[PDB]
């Protein structure tokens, strides 16, 4: 009469991980997404259920201080048909009972402890079934992070390899990145990352209860990448002397960054920069289920303190004399996260710009975001989370002053530089770049742009010698060779002029730091004939820039054309990206799941001098569980090619993007990638 | 005593089709590759083998007139260990006997009839086990068509969707093509194609015996595409009036072409052009196992009768007055097949240029090929199969004569046109274009090129006013809008000139046919100031070219600059490709094998006028067994976008390239493609 119910072999079906799009994550722990029912199988050694005999209720607690009011702890009874924490009986057969548990769409994210309390009237018992991790659901309708396009959900959540776009605005290069959010151990690393955040240390219960909202999780996640004081994922150095750590450009996948962080206590890992911060932030948010895409903005006005107007003071040569002034970044990277905003006036649901790179502010040094991109486009700077900084970054106006020899400065015309240019992020389902510049700004000169700027109360700036000049490069220039770049002057006036044109080309880092000039040509008496174009060539030599070039291979050409009669100053500036040698990747053998695959990577040295200490680094999520590195024994000469073969074992079927990086003493951070389609065994 | 051996349920294992890389082809018929052993399972209803009791020999015949000397018929006995037609016993279990049959590497290709003659001493019997198709093996070492790189074998044989590169040399567009060699029924269509060829009609036995060599099969296959008289796959019209048939540019996959051919008796299908001939030839050869890649050559000297020197006579405006003269083709397509050549001096193994497009010759009208590309590069025109024609196509010299008003003609300088330019074919394993121009020609001005030209006994042609002119387009121009193209003159001489510059832009077809001019600007007194560049603009209007534009969207700009003092003629010509509107393709639902998948295709109309009778055609090998076509009910207006949804059921897992074509009255043959990765069920 009324025998105690005893259970054994509780199994949390890994088939529901395919249902929850957490298939890769379901390795020795059950990971599911909120707002969606997940299968649960219970095995007993007696009566299968005996509902008319036994009543049992589930209790789940996630935080260290679980609270029912806070939403971190909830207990629910079992019923045969449907607060939104619901456990229901799908079926009973043999000695096995099959249940379907449902989590609320606003449930907090984190590790959960599942306990069952089965009291059959008299007596009864309580014990823990297991542990599971609840992530944001991009497929669950009414979840804050919901995407209506399945391809969009797949690319912005499930896809582990993508492109980080960098280089120059005129010539954009897609550097491959392996986000690898589902690489082994990363989810626990992200949970540790959240569990050591300042809000949690201050009040763990408040934080764990507040982790339901994607906006809070995004703020914390981006903050944990090299933003706040004490613990962080990365440490930032911009001075181009990364001797004691991994170079910022050397990175090819964020997986090793997180692994380095957790393995060495929780010390900031090596050296990181704006793209690295955005890439690891996107890895964390994608792992946690928040749809996130890394975005690059070219000619970005970073470090200005939310400033719409930047004034540059230049000398007679056009070089900027400011010692306090911060230069326009060649490009800046930040992330965008797809979520709904219930703390703002309705209609701001969508892409939110989270900038994990710390920005200078009067309040202090701290990363901006998340601000709806809609606010930036409409100029609604009153929106809560760091709207003016991002808007100023995209829509800053730059004014170039040239110092006259007599007293005051004179205004020059620079039409070659436009801020917030060629905003780009990887397209959904393709390798092509998607230009999202329209998402942040309206078309220039439109009524809609005018009203949006008026909303920011920023209506300033559009001209007053019928001449123009721009920098032209002709055909492409590869890194490691001397090449010519031309300064093209277009005179469409009856007047014929004698002028002074000053050309200076300087090795420049991606964040605007200018090194010493690698090319200089000054003409004090240049004759511009009427209604004609004149092109003055500047020869840039490999030897002149080799020592002081960045790892971003950026070189800035500046030209200043002065008409003396009317004393008119015309300025043209353009950033060249010296192209690295291509990496030729050959896949050897038939590519199949859990089958040895050989990848042969080779590059042909493009320098006059020999390359020494060459090292190939290869990383892929689904292609190799661990990063593969090969060191080349002997130096590689001027003509010679470096070719090596690395064995990989891919355990995931499907498309994966293998990223390769070659590093040498004279050539650094040359990237390559190859799409690999793994078949079934 | 000595019971008769009776067999039943003979099964030709479809698992060996995965072994033979014929997995897609193994549908209700066994297709295997020569030079490799294929599994065979025999079921009996008595003694499993009783070798000490029964001796049985296999006999296979392929042709209609099988001959042992010819190699079309061969009979071989069964032994337990290894003429190269070998049947051996791998294993015996229960009532089942498992054999492994081996075909010779030089075995002829075609349909084979497998017969077994089992005589157990006294009596015995004979009967047919089944039918199988033997194809070229690119994986079998020592087979003539052998590739050492697995990726190369996969792309040049197994890959069913690729790119046909066309457009202009300066701006190359990759048109997607669905070769679909493994699409249902195509292999039988190709065998019918071979079985109706002239050599077979003349002497079937000789042809079937000669089908062992890939060179013979290639000659016949390329011939059957619109080359020889009577039966052919395609019929060619170049006059741009394809009313009664499918347009040459409308095609997106060669599968429908072959199906149209066989379904309607064997009548030439619709209208075809050089790329169509090459595409169907590549489909046939890839289906038959010969590694083949379609190759495009820009500024190709086709229809010249193997001529290394082409003379053009032009008027005062630079327009070509020749009424007999054939113009330089903007681009020409042909195929390349990988095979060894035993009919030539050793060392010509490799890519063979087969040009299925019929070329004018003194002997008659007939397609060239297969000539080793090595011969073209080395200038060894004595090589057997149409070497001088292809070499002349790539390395022809063009001389432009401008007729003087007084008597004779005067020689002009055209540095804007170089023949055999930007030779390109789809890369192996990627969508990127691979430039194979180096494969046909050595670097200009090198000693190796000089000796190669000397081998062709073609050493002619490199100049004698320090001026130059080229056509510049600035930013891209989309089709359906007016745009400006500039004629850029560079004077680097102390002399200042007054000159006459004549600009004429004419709608041009891809094979050089020039329609009426859509832009004209003539300046009789243009002033070029010293040491300066002058750009003269020509406005090309949509209304001016809409009626007479080709389906290739090609427009040829011609500029003639005449200096009168020294009477120097400078010529610049360039072909623009008006870019079509992009097709935005959205994949809806999770993509899985044998699961309904929705593809939404949409394009935004780029014309001033409305589009009527819009029709979307969608084709994919592995995505749809049959071509899917949707007709848009109402006209699409100037602003509006055309968007439609087509259900597809993909039955093959893996990567497939879905090709889409949109056709309307005002916009024609706009292409798009999307890579689709089909997961398992
Ligand atoms: N500006 C720039 N152009 C590059 C770079 N690398 C290659 N290119 C080539 O430069 C060409 C584009 O130059 P463009 O913007 O048209 O200059 P312009 O036409 O002379 O005014 C392309 O053919 C590119 O392949 C680079 O780092 N910067
Ligand atoms: N020549 C040509 N250029 C095109 C076409 N369509 C787009 N373009 C654009 O033209 C630019 C390249 O022109 P380029 O060869 O550098 O001319 P140039 O620098 O003015 O002498 C690229 O930015 C292309 O995007 C076309 O059909 N023909
Ligand atoms: Ca988007
Ligand atoms: Ca001008
Ligand atoms: Ca090749
Ligand atoms: Ca000049």
Numbering used by the authors:
A (entry chain A), B (entry chain A): 2 to 83, 86 to 464, 466 to 468, 471 to 687
Text from the published report:
Transglutaminase 2 (TG2) is a calcium-dependent enzyme that regulates many biological processes, including apoptosis, autophagy, inflammation, and extracellular matrix formation. TG2 is regulated by the binding of guanine nucleotides and Ca2+. The transamidation activity of TG2 is inhibited by GTP or GDP binding, which stabilizes its closed structure, thereby obstructing the accessibility of substrates to the active sites. In contrast, Ca2+ acts as a cofactor in the transamidation activity by inducing conformational change to the active open form.
To identify the Ca2+ binding sites, a Ca2+-containing crystal of TG2 was produced in totally different crystallization conditions from those used for the previous structural study of TG2. A relatively low-resolution structure of 3.56 Å was solved and refined to Rwork = 22.5% and Rfree = 26.3%. The structure revealed that the asymmetric unit (ASU) cell contained three molecules. The final structural models were constructed with residues 2-687 for chain A, residues 3-687 for chain B, and residues 9-687 for chain C. GDP was detected at the nucleotide binding site in each chain. After careful analysis by comparing the current structure with previous TG2 structures that do not contain Ca2+, we identified two tentative Ca2+ binding sites in the structure of TG2. The first binding site is located in the catalytic domain and is coordinated by the side chains of E437, Y159, and E155. The second binding site is located in the β-barrel 1 domain and is coordinated by the main chains of N497 and F537, and side chains of E539 and N498. Binding of Ca2+ to E437 and E539 induced some structural changes in two loops of TG2, amino acids 406–412 and 460–470. Thus, binding of Ca2+ to E437 and E539 is likely to promote an open active conformation of TG2 by altering the hinge structure. Intriguingly, the present Ca2+ bound TG2 crystal structure is a GDP-bound compact form that binds Ca2+ at only two sites, namely, E437 and E539.
